[PDB]
Amino acid sequence: MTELCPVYAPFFGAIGCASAIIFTSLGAAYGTAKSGVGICATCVLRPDLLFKNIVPVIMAGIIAIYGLVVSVLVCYSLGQKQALYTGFIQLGAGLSVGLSGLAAGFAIGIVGDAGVRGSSQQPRLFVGMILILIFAEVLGLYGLIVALLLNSRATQDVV
Amino acid sequence: IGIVGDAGVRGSSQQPRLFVGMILILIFAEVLGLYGLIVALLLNSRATQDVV
Amino acid sequence: MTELCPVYAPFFGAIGCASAIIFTSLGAAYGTAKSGVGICATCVLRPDLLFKNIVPVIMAGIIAIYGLVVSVLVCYSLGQKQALYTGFIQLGAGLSVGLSGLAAGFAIGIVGDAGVRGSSQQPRLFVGMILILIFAEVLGLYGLIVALLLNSRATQDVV
Amino acid sequence: ASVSEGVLRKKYTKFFQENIKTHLDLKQALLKEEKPETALLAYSLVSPSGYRGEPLTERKILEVVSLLDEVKVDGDTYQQLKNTFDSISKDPRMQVSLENQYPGKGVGLLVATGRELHKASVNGDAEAYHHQLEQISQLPGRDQRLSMPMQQTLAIGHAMLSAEGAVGATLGMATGYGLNNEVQDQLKQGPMSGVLPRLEISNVKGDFTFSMQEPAAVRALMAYLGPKEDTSMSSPQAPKEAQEMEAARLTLKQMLGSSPNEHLVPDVDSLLKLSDEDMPSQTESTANGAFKKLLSEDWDWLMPAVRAMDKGEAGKINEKLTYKLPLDAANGRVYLDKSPNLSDAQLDALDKLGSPSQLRLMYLAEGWI
């Protein structure tokens, strides 16, 4: 409790549990808003292909589900009388998945906006757009992997 | 909800088929607040659980 | 908790693990967004250069794998009772690959959109684009080499 | 000038004013005027199976479709349609056409969302294919009576399937009726589609009746009009009942625009391919690939290419569809040109086909080639 496990350790497990869903929600909100200004501006002189253009909004929703996954696993390992090691690992995992989700959401929004705009002139660009949006989608998955590997070792061999 | 609601309103005059496509985008903006609300309610159930 | 192994020592390694994947994801996000605007504006006109023009997005996607292979090696050297020297080394290994990947991603994005807009007017510019993008790609590999040379010395002669 | 339509429901407002909610004495309130040779003909759309086991005896659509059939300007074209349809509903070849198009009568979240978004995009491209196919029959030389309501039915069904796929993907992603009804009534507005006859069927199973404003019956009708006539069924050496059904089949197939020696078999299957007798003639598959390359690269390259191809100008396609767009490059705007790069081996094959038959262009828009 002294030489390990202080009383301010769950602070770093609370902020790191809140940091994931906040910054993944900022990335998802930017991606949704930017893509949905591209939609409803390119689908106003063309009411068909409105419902096929909602691909980037699905991607931003997946970016939010990543941070919803990490914040539930960090919450169940919180508790009074835990180590500083566990709190630092939980903060690092939360910041990792949150800011990777923020970067991936900016990429999804900016690419999907231009792709949805320019796909109303060239129908072979849609298949191109998804092929770029997967490359922006795997950026969030890398931070999700780092968060899962950190949270796997937050309480292994911890006294 | 502010940014994509405004554009869908302004586009839904000259294209009446776009109102259904806006609500599918406003649902994805709505479920971000649900995810924050779920993590907030799931933390609050542990606030006085095994606290001495 | 000695003087050479305190309890706040995993803080530096934990935010060195997070800083590796954060700053390579921002570089890969800018290198994907800046390049993918110029691909979606050019394959409107030339829909059959699409798989030819995808190569700066692949080059930006390699940068995040550098940060991933730095973050998974720092994470396996974290411990509760580690030294401050190990935490300093893990900070250095995170920040080197992170900021080198950030600069490389800025360069790859800004070169790649101009290259795919210029290669579709002159087909003999696509080899010059790859030649400049290889020089922009190796700036992240230098930080990867430094991060792998630091991490090899984190627990050599450490008490 | 093959057909014209209207959408104002206040001109013939007597038969839709009060609560006329019964097929009993619906023809008795239908005279109401000097209509003698033009009153019982409009009832003939709902006369066989509009009372004999009819739900509700009317609805909002089934009675509005009867008084939008104003035939007072001329009653010859729809009379030939009433003689041609239901003379075709006798052979078993039409019966099996109405059986293949009818029934008997975690990571799994990513997989289900992928299925729904595939449904949305595939049923959304075909609606655009049909919207640029109802301006091909706007061209001179075509028809606007049998083609126009036939391909305004398929676009509505594809729009409904696209909205259903998007609503399904959204409802599945946000979790793992009132939205589908809001897109259903919205597509019921705008212009008004012309009527086609009803195609009642009376076989040994029972008295069936399909609608031809539903996409299943439309999709089952054009598969019947596909194959060419054989050595039988048209000769005057087995004249049993063939000069009333095969003549009707051929006049519909010609009314679309298809020659009597064109085959056009559907190709959607999981089985082995079209063997050799239903397989095309190597100057048709090349032409079909040229049409698919025209559809896949622009949203406005099928109608001007068909307009040029009807004039015999099908070698001038590469330099009449070219147009210039700007590109803001690193050295200023350059105004490059997009053009359909047809090869010569598919530019002369479009000379082999004189005029594209509308039946071929409707298998093209539905995906059966």
Curated annotation (Swiss-Prot), chain B:
Name of the protein described by the UniProt record: V-type proton ATPase subunit c
One term under GO cellular component: vacuolar proton-transporting V-type ATPase complex
Name of the gene: VMA3
Keyword terms of this UniProt record: Hydrogen ion transport, Ion transport, Membrane, Transmembrane, Transmembrane helix, Transport, Vacuole
Subcellular location as annotated: Vacuole membrane
Family that this chain belongs to: Belongs to the V-ATPase proteolipid subunit family.
Vacuolar membrane side: 44-52
Positions in the Cytoplasmic compartment: 6-17
